[PDB]
Each structure stands twice: as C-alpha cells, then as structure tokens.
From a paper:
Many proteins, including the [name]/[name] histone acetyltransferases (HATs), contain several targetable domains. [name] and [name] broadly regulate the activity of other proteins through their protein acetyltransferase catalytic activity. These proteins contain several highly homologous domains, including KIX, bromodomains (BRDs) and HAT domains, through which they interact with, dock to, and acetylate target proteins, respectively. Using crystallography, we identify the binding mechanism of the [name]/[name]-specific BRD inhibitor CCS1477 in complex with the [name], [name] and BRD4 BRDs, and define components of the CCS1477 catalytic binding core that are required for compound activity.
The resultant compounds displayed a >1000-fold loss of affinity for [name] and [name]. A co-crystal structure of the [name] bromodomain with compound 1 demonstrated that the side chain R1173 is more flexible than in co-crystal structures with CCS1477 and assumes a conformation incompatible for hydrogen-bonding with the piperidinone oxygen, while weakly interacting with a nitrogen of the benzimidazole core. Notably, activity against BRD4 was reduced by ~10-fold, indicating that the hydrophobic van-der-Waals (VDW) interactions observed between the difluorophenyl moiety of CCS1477 and the WPF shelf of BRD4 contribute to binding affinity, but relatively less so in the [name]/[name] bromodomain. To further evaluate the specific effects of CCS1477-int(1) as a case example, we performed further CellTiter-Glo dose-response growth assays in HDMB03 and MB002 G3MB cells, demonstrating a blunting of anti-growth effect in cells treated with CCS1477-int(1), as compared with CCS1477. Thus, the difluorophenyl group is a critical moiety in the CCS1477 pharmacophore that facilitates potent interaction with the bromodomain of [name]/[name] and is required for efficacy in cell line models of G3MB.
Residue numbers in the entry:
A (entry chain B), B (entry chain A): 1082 to 1197
The structure:
Amino acid sequence: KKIFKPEELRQALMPTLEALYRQDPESLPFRQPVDPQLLGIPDYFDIVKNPMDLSTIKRKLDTGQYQEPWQYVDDVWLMFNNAWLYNRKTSRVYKFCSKLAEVFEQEIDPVMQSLG
Amino acid sequence: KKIFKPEELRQALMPTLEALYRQDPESLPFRQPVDPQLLGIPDYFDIVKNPMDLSTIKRKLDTGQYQEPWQYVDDVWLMFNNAWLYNRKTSRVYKFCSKLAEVFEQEIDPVMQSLG
Ligand SMILES: Cc1noc(C)c1-c1ccc2c(c1)nc([C@@H]1CCCC(=O)N1)n2[C@H]1CC[C@@H](NC(=O)OC(C)(C)C)CC1
Ligand SMILES: Cc1noc(C)c1-c1ccc2c(c1)nc([C@@H]1CCCC(=O)N1)n2[C@H]1CC[C@@H](NC(=O)OC(C)(C)C)CC1
Ligand SMILES: [Mg+2]
C-alpha cells in the first residue's frame, strides 16, 4: 500500500551509499562507470550488459528514479555482481568489491527494517 | 588420459556461465545462494540438501575446484534441478530456471564437444 516519498527514500538510503564512498581505496574503481577504452578491456561489455556504479546510483537517488527501496538495493547488488563476475577472485578489484559488499550489508539491514 | 588444467577449463567453461548471467530478469534469483530466511520459505533446506547457484559455480571455476568439465556441468544441472524441484511448474522461478536451462544447453553443447 505504502508510497515512498522521494526525499524520505533519499534520506534513509543515501547514508548507506555514503558509507561506500568513504572506503578508500576500495570505492575508487566504483565511483565512476567502468570505461573499457581507458582500461583497455574490450570484452567488458560482452560480459556486463547492465553496467552500474556509485555515481549512477547517486544520480538516481538525487533525481527520484527509485520508487521503492529494493530498487536501490538491486542496483547496488548489480554493481557488486558485475565486478565479481568480470574479475577473478584473486584480483584487487574483486577484493575491493567484497569490502564494499561487507560495508553495505552492515549498513542496509537496519535501514530496510525501518522502511518496511 | 587427458588432464584438464584449471585455467584451461576456466577459459572453456566461463563463457557458458557468462551467458546465463546475461539473462535479465531470469538469472537474478540464481546470482546468489537462496536465502530461505530472507524469502520466508523455511522448508527450503528440507527439500534442497545440496544448494547451488551461479556465484558458487563461478567461485569454483576461479579457484580450480573442477577437475573435468562434467563436474562443472553437474553443478549447473544441480542448480536447475533444485529450482525445478522446489518450485511449481507454473511459478515464475521455475520458468526462469527453464530459460537458463535452454541457454545453457545451447552454450555447453559445442564447448563439451571441443573439450572431448
Ligand atoms: C569496477 C571495475 N570492474 O571491473 C573493472 C576492470 C573495474 C575497474 C574500474 C576502474 C578502475 C579499475 C578497475 N582499476 C583502476 C585503477 C587503474 C588501473 C588499474 C589499477 O590497478 N587501479 N581503476 C581506475 C580507472 C580510472 C580512475 N578514474 C577516472 O576515470 O578518472 C578520470 C579523470 C575520469 C579519467 C579511477 C578507477
Ligand atoms: C533460485 C530460487 N529457487 O527457489 C527460489 C524461491 C528461488 C529464488 C531466489 C531468489 C529470489 C527469488 C526466488 N525471487 C526473488 C525476488 C524477490 C522475492 C520475490 C520476487 O518475486 N523476486 N529473489 C531475489 C531475492 C534477493 C535478491 N538479492 C539479494 O539477496 O540482495 C542482497 C543485497 C544480498 C540482500 C535477488 C533474488
Ligand atoms: Mg560477510
């Protein structure tokens, strides 16, 4: 039944995104979209058909593109699954992604309990 | 008596797993282990005694846990059989599983032929 007010969603959810940004160095690969030309990885978009990154999620929060909090959680989880799929378990970026996922899991659980 | 090296298997088999990940929305329930507490299905682990999902399979490919290609195929097929067993034929999840199974059959057929 409930309609989420855009600023209510933004206020509840942005602290969880801000917690990811504070992770340095782990958030740095995730602060802007993956650029396969800069990185020299022409197969990236062969494998990742739905790219996502922190700046895109932040812009969707700013502009009211999320109707309900699970749409935001789905984008954060998509971001992580893209990096875990494309990069090997031993790689730096994969370990960075796991650290962000660890932080996100700790932040998001009490927030979603209070929203639903 | 051919020996299959970890990286050899990974290069051959990873594309077939990547093809499943590309299916959206159908791969989304399969990208992480089933969480019966999150989903509110407490009998899940009564029926599924050997859970399996894409992220676990990907990890086993990354870490060399498959000795031969059929061990990978067996895990993908276990994944599917778990979903078809637990969910009814008319359910969304079951239909999503069938879609992944159709993609997998098309992708694995030539790969297995080239490996043997
Ligand atoms: C995620 C992901 N998933 O797969 C992959 C693959 C990634 C991913 C993405 C970015 C990565 C990254 C891995 N490795 C690094 C760096 C550089 C190379 C290797 C290294 O060791 N450290 N970067 C940086 C690239 C550009 C930087 N900023 C940026 O573009 O500055 C402007 C001014 C706008 C030009 C910041 C981040
Ligand atoms: C397979 C299978 N076999 O039996 C069953 C049963 C499944 C199965 C499994 C997952 C399912 C699923 C069915 N239905 C959905 C969604 C939500 C439920 C209602 C719906 O209509 N669609 N999900 C999602 C659950 C959580 C999602 N992500 C996730 O955990 O995010 C973090 C951040 C880590 C918390 C991704 C997938
Ligand atoms: Mg953990």
